[PDB]
């Protein structure tokens, strides 16, 4: 056969008769307008096809032509800075072509521009007749000033070079490489086609050792994440699950950034592409905007529900491809709970039996096959480069309830879990990461990095997590039996933990001094507030009974100027770098002398 | 007793959904067969047979149905049950989910072919577990010590360090010299696979471990035939090669979750919370393959780790496990928040074979009474601690001095300390020293006399 015929439509799914030689997960095009669909089930002569666009007006007598290929992206230059939908069609070309403000629901816009020309240069001793394998760099293309899009071979094939293009400007459809095999001399180009449901082959995985500097104070200190790690950000509506995701895409220590909007708002992707081209960052003393390193996969809630499956798998396929260049890729999935609602709506039409709360039984296998594609890993190919993929997947639980089959299947896979709280957003405590229920399992793996650069921070967080731990048990005390009967070793605990909750954990992301703090500033103000609790420990412990001693109202009325240096320590904007370490020891020296005074 | 007729090859699939492939026109199909799906791309996938009906047979492929056509695939019927190639050489190597090697090695040379379902033991000729295994953990050997041959899970929750106390009872696995660990990893990450693969080569113990692994990358149908194929090599080394094994299945909850996907795709009538009705029996045939026979010298003990969803012991995975096994080890969340390693809660954890693995002949005279008394002051101490937050007796602060000293000094022992049982009872008696002689009700005076003043 070469095409099919629709037999019945019901929402997103499409049953198509006269379709025998079609495999599972093919890419067919149903309708007179050729809506792009994928086969998800077939029973004998018919196939059941989910459709990545809105089925409306699709009749029974419509043709369904099949292509014999899975859902695949086009990987090559022209992919950074642009904005795509779930099936990788560029949203900037699709409005400069049709001149409208809508997506015309039938257009086959090429995923990469076959008209713009990039300056190619070969990989500098790639000789003719040299042996070449699958996945090594045979040329460099400078897409922007920041990113050198290293052209690679597909991982399937390999051979001996017969022709390489001379250094110059080429299209994305020009033949650049021809390789001889046993049978056939095979042509190539600058683009490659890879199926999004198949994991990219790679040499051997490596342990993760370098941390992901997100810039937040509570995130980098208590629950750190490494590049090559998996992270989940749950929390109810209005908690700020995306302002941590937009703080990751602006100020991370990552080479490229790929932001995936899966069932997101339409204004939240327009918020991204507006304020990014004025945020210039430096790498080698040169400033350029972060839109050179950010690629948006935009699939809003208005856009159809079967395409939410594709926008997650596309954005991790671009993230796996840029990993093969050696770049330390990051990925912000936003949000995977709207992806799991696409699995429920599709399986509802197929009469599948549900698991707990509506979702299908394979929900734990789709999330595991997506989160486990992250991790720093020595790539394929001869130039011997080590890349990474770090997945930060936002989760939107309904009603703020973490006993949910999306979240409970997520936490068995992710290592870091930044549990946001809804009570911490009524009081304007931003970021709202609940420091009790949140955890990270990167800590034992990260102190080896800490015993090289910042050699005092592991005993710091052990006491910083402890003072927040003892505050929670004593908060239930003072709300029942009152604060009047409290001890003096515990009333100092209730103040410095309240001093942590407005200095350290609170962080106004829109001011010039707390929109991104480095790690020396974060370890700086924590090395003082813990030393303040350690010094005020001795003021009660050693002179406990004998002398008419410090009852700490002595301290709170006399040391108010040093506490004002602590309560305003966070105000060091990035115009001072070496001064902040001096002021950290200067405000310590004000704290050093007053135990004698 | 070998078969020699040439195998048929059916090119007549007629339906595929999820992990299932439905065949037609099959001539005399057999239940629980093994097949070989040859894809049009030349890929080879295997599969059991879930249900025959006349000329139909619905197979479940292991490596997923992605790519299977309706006319070009060919499914070749092997005329027997899935029989794994087992050998003594399956020791010191690393295998994937179903049966293939990982460390660039050979396929095994098949000393004998054994059924992965096993065959049921005679309950009359099964000797009782009496010899006590010293795990080194004070929270186990002090309170709920495990005997050789005893099946006993570690009830964890998601996020808790259950893998670091899984490898802790590998290095400190010994009696109070051929302790061949058989490991089975189901639904683990790569960063948890590196924590188990590179912690058996660190102690040099990789000359006796048979680490299986089934990562989250690998498909979910292979999780079903992992503990049936990891036990039947452990059943070979312990009943046919007279070697003491210890099998540590991992993440039983994930093994169940793979059972739910096949059950929901089969459209069977389900049980509690989506799991199939037969999960009690399905978790019984991979749990009851433990203990030791009376005719041989070997033994097989089972420590199957499982995480409970949302810290719930009433979930069907820890519920049916506590009805098949012989008591649990409940590593808790709140003790982990107080930075205890291992964070084992000693109140719901239990061992039904601690009563017959302790005493004057086995370990020492005071094991039976210090384990009841440390349990007594911990259980009475908890409800008075709840009234403490919301006084009234000077002996109530004695019980809260027990709670402050129990969690910090007894159960907390660090990641590399191996307390022997002779060292364990001395630290347990020091906790009862803060209580008077009269307040220890469940210790008789004949055992309280010579042990309390020291």
């Amino acid at each position: 056969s070469t095409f099919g015929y629709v037999h019945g439509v019901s929402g997103p799914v499409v049953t198509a008769c006269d379709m025998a030689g079609a495999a599972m997960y093919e890419l067919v095009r149903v309708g007179h307008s050729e809506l792009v669909g994928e086969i998800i089930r077939l029973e004998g002569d018919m196939a059941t096809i989910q459709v990545y666009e809105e089925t409306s007006g699709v009749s029974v007598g419509d043709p369904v032509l099949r292509t014999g290929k899975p859902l695949s992206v086009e990987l090559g230059p022209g992919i950074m800075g642009a904005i795509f939908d779930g099936i990788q069609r560029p949203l900037s070309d699709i409005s400069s072509q049709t001149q409208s403000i809508y997506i015309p629901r039938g257009v086959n816009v090429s995923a990469l521009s076959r008209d713009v020309k990039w300056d190619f240069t070969p990989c500098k001793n790639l000789r003719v007749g040299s042996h070449i394998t699958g996945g090594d760099i045979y040329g460099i293309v400078n897409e922007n000033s920041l990113i050198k899009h290293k052209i690679m071979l597909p991982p399937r094939n390999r051979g001996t070079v017969t022709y390489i293009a001379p250094p110059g400007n080429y299209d994305t459809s020009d033949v650049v490489l021809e390789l001889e095999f046993e049978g056939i001399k095979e042509k190539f180009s600058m683009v490659q086609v890879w199926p999004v449901r198949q994991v990219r082959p790679v040499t051997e995985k490596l342990p993760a050792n370098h941390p992901l500097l997100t810039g937040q104070r509570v995130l980098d200190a208590l629950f750190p994440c490494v590049q090559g790690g998996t992270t989940a950000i749950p929390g109810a509506f209005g908690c700020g699950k995306t302002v941590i995701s937009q703080s990751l895409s602006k100020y991370s220590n990552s080479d490229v950034i790929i932001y995936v909007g899966c069932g997101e708002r339409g204004n939240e992707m327009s918020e991204v592409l507006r304020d990014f081209p004025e945020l210039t960052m430096e790498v080698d003393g040169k400033v350029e905007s972060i839109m050179k390193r950010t690629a948006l996969v935009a699939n809003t809630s208005n856009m159809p529900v079967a395409a939410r499956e594709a926008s997650i798998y596309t954005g991790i396929t671009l993230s796996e491809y840029f990993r093969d260049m050696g770049y330390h890729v990051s990925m912000m999935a936003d949000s995977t709970s709207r992806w799991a609602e696409a699995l429920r709506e599709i399986s509802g039409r197929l009469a599948e039996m549900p698991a707990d709360s509506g979702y299908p039984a394979y929900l734990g296998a789709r999330l595991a096959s997506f989160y486990e594609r992250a991790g720093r890993v020595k790539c394929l190919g001869n130039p011997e480069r080590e890349g990474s993929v770090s997945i930060v997947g936002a989760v939107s639980p309904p009603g703020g309830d973490f006993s949910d089959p999306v979240t409970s299947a997520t936490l068995g896979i992710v290592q870091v879990f930044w549990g946001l709280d809804k009570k911490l957003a009524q009081r304007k405590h931003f970021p709202s990461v609940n420091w009790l229920i949140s955890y990270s399992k990167y800590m034992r793996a990260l102190d080896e990095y800490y015993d090289k650069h910042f050699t005092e921070f592991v005993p710091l967080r052990t006491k910083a997590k402890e003072i927040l731990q003892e505050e929670e048990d004593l908060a239930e005390i003072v709300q029942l039996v009152g604060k009047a009967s409290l001890a003096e070793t515990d009333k100092i605990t209730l103040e410095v933990a309240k001093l942590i909750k407005d200095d350290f954990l609170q962080q106004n992301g829109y001011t010039p001094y707390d929109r991104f703090c480095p790690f020396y500033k974060t370890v700086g103000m924590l090395s003082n507030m813990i030393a303040f609790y350690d010094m005020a420990r001795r003021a009660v412990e050693t002179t406990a009974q004998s002398d008419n001693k410090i009852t700490w109202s002595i301290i709170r009325e006399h040391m108010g100027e040093i506490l004002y240096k602590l309560s305003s320590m966070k105000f060091k904007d990035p115009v001072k770098d070496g001064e902040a370490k001096i002021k950290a020891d200067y405000a310590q020296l004000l704290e050093d002398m007053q135990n004698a005074f | 007793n070998y078969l020699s007729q040439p195998r048929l090859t059916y090119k007549t699939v007629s339906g595929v959904n999820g992990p299932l492939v439905i065949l037609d026109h099959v001539k005399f199909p057999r239940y629980a067969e093994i097949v070989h799906l040859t894809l049009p791309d030349g890929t080879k996938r295997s599969g059991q047979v879930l249900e025959v009906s006349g000329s139909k047979a619905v197979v479940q492929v292991f490596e997923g149905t992605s790519g299977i056509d309706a006319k070009k695939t060919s499914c070749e019927f092997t005329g027997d049950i899935l029989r794994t190639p087992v050998s003594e050489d399956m020791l010191g190597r690393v295998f994937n989910g179903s049966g293939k090697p990982i460390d660039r090695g050979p396929v095994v040379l098949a000393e004998d072919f054994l059924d992965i379902m096993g065959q049921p033991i005679n309950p009359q000729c099964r000797i009782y577990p009496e010899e006590m295994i010293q795990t080194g953990i004070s929270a186990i050997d002090g309170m709920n010590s495990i005997a050789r041959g005893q099946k006993i899970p570690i009830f964890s929750a998601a996020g808790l360090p259950h893998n670091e106390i899984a490898a802790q009872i590998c290095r400190q696995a010994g009696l109070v010299e051929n302790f061949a660990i058989v490991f089975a990893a189901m639904g683990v990450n790569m960063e948890t696979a590196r924590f188990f693969k590179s912690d058996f080569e660190e102690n040099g113990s990789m000359d006796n471990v048979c680490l299986f692994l089934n990562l989250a990358n690998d498909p979910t149908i292979e999780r079903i035939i992992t503990p049936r194929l990891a036990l039947t090599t452990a059943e070979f080394l312990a009943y046919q090669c007279e070697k003491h094994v210890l099998v540590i299945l991992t993440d039983m909850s994930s093994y169940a979750e793979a059972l739910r996907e096949v059950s929901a795709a089969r459209e069977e009538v389900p049980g509690r919370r989506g799991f199939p009705g037969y999960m009690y029996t399905d978790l019984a045939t991979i749990y009851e393959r433990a203990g030791r026979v009376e005719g041989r010298n070997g033994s097989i003990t089972q420590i199957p780790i499982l995480t409970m969803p949302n810290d719930d012991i009433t979930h069907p995975i820890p519920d049916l496990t506590g009805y098949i096994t012989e008591g649990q080890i409940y590593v808790d969340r709140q003790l982990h928040n107080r930075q205890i390693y291992p964070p084992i809660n000693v109140l719901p954890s239990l061992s039904r074979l601690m009563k017959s693995a302790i005493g004057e002949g086995m370990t020492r005279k005071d094991h039976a009474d210090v384990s009841n008394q440390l349990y007594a002051c911990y259980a009475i101490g908890k409800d008075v601690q709840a009234m403490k937050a919301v006084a009234l007796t000077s002996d109530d602060l004695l019980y809260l001095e027990f709670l402050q000293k129990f969690e910090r000094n007894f159960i907390a022992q660090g990641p590399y300390e191996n307390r022997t049982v002779y060292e364990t009872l001395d630290i347990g008696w020091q906790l009862l020293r803060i209580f008077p002689k009269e307040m220890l009700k469940r210790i008789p005076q004949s055992t309280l006399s010579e042990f309390y003043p020291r």
């Binding site: 009469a351 039996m353 549900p354 | 459209e267 009538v269 389900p270 989506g274």
Partner: peptide, 19 residues
Amino acid sequence: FYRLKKIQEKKKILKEKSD
């Protein structure tokens, strides 16, 4: 009530396929 009613409809569709 959704899982049991799904089987009640699938016991009828399987019945009329036999009839």
